[PDB]
Symmetry: D2
Subunit: 125 residues, 4 copies
């Protein structure tokens, strides 16, 4: 199994009130659903990603990332967000991320296609 | 099937000489392998992502993203890259991306954990 | 004078323990010094930037940005950081930023030239 | 004088057709005007920044950054862009940048306050 397979698997909440439900596979797979508290989004969206299943043992975090395309049976916001970050274990486990949200645009509007931000996920709240 | 399922599926090359091999699913899934021409990487790595399988019909691109965790049977660079961008069809199809590469770090080094960059993928070269 | 000229001018501290000393001009100028608690840096470095001297009056923040080139009389880290963000007034005034740190590189290493991160500045601590 | 003071000073054009007019000071100062071909912008805006006035001599680029607040006598877009990048000399001199465009927002909209992108500047076109 992945070193932090058990630590990552479960339900996570970020500072916006969004909910990230993920299962970590022994190989490095991440699968689950994402529910955003903000934006052009309703209910759950499929997510898939990857994590380092054998991280360093020197106190470093565990690198990971995942993607949501903002289309489900209710809405399509013609956009995708990728979160890139690291999982930090301990009494107050966290996933610290930065993210890129690209919207499909015309070529004329490509310069304003991508938002950047940062989300911190915790196991409570 | 996804509107650009056929357009996205296949082999892609970026400006660094890296190779991105992907299969787009009818639902929005992306699966494949990534081979980086630079960095602490050798051979192919698993990737997984998502794309908008029903994009706008007004000339906008198709939003997508995917993740590579840089661990395979040869190396582990304790890091993950996510690419966020859009697919643009036509005679010269392109996937235009920006990316975030997060390395697992100690808490003291978290401020320098994440590189940002941009890759353009084409079907030739 | 700028609407938040008085609110921005002064000494600010971020979550790393760095110190940002700035004077806002009536026109939109920002001038001052930056002292980083981390990285290849010692003592104060010149900074210069710009802010919106007539922001919206609807409760929106005040957009601003500034640059430090990491050369002073003690060290040269061959790099520059730009912070882009917004000033938020009130009892707990804050400057919320994201930043890009580019190092001079060879062309072969340009893909790993730029770190991205986020700093929050407060008037205390 | 700065090692690339003469190389940086002058008029630069990016891929959008915007015009960047800058003077590099011997100390590391950058001053000038920016005219954007896209967005909520008309005519010239003040810019100020910093560059490494004594870069490495090993073939590395020269790190630099600058800021524009998008207010002038014609318009105010309540936003600021910072470009962070490096100057590369030679027959085809370039300034390769990534940028962050933050708009003043309410706290509820802060998650969508910042665009990210990349501009390449050349001395022709
Ligand atoms: O909301 C979405 C899907 C939801 C995205 C939620 C984000 S993921 C990062 C973060 N962490 C989180 O938990 N939740 C947020 N996708 C289109 C994102 C359109 N713009 C902004 C929102 C909006 C809502 C309605 C109408 C127009 N926009 C993108 C910014 C932009 C740039 C240029 C022109 C227009 N818009
Ligand atoms: O190379 C990797 C895996 C390969 C990543 C390849 C990138 S994906 C984005 C881009 N598009 C592409 O096709 N290919 C590149 N992951 C660790 C990335 C360590 N640093 C830089 C490289 C390195 C190689 C050897 C020793 C040290 N580093 C990250 C930057 C950093 C910050 C602070 C301290 C140290 N390093
Ligand atoms: O430290 C600096 C100057 C200090 C920068 C301080 C940052 S500004 C953003 C943040 N907010 C803050 O208050 N403080 C920090 N500039 C070179 C930054 C070299 N790398 C990482 C540090 C380092 C220290 C010693 C030896 C090597 N690196 C950049 C990452 C990288 C990528 C690839 C290869 C190598 N390094
Ligand atoms: O245009 C501006 C000023 C011009 C900025 C020009 C950019 S600098 C980076 C790049 N290189 C360049 O040479 N030129 C461009 N500042 C507000 C930028 C508002 N949004 C997008 C544009 C817009 C125009 C009219 C009405 C609404 N927007 C920001 C994206 C966003 C996110 C969420 C909600 C709404 N908008
Ligand atoms: Cu190891
Ligand atoms: Cu806008
Ligand atoms: Cu639609
Ligand atoms: Cu370094
Ligand atoms: Cu206004
Ligand atoms: Cu490295
Ligand atoms: Cu040197
Ligand atoms: Cu929008």
């Amino acid at each position: 199994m992945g070193r932090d397979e058990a630590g990552i698997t479960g339900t996570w909440y970020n500072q916006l009130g969004s909910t990230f439900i993920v299962t970590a596979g022994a190989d490095g797979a991440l699968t689950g659903t994402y529910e955003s508290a903000v934006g052009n989004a309703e209910s759950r969206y499929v997510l898939t990603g990857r994590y380092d299943s054998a991280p360093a043992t020197d106190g470093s975090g565990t690198a990971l990332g995942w993607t949501v395309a903002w289309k489900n049976n209710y809405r399509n916001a013609h956009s995708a967000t990728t979160w890139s970050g690291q999982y930090v274990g301990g009494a107050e486990a966290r996933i610290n991320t930065q993210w890129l949200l690209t919207s499909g645009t015309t070529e004329a509007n490509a310069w304003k296609s991508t938002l950047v931000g940062h989300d911190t996920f915790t196991k409570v709240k």
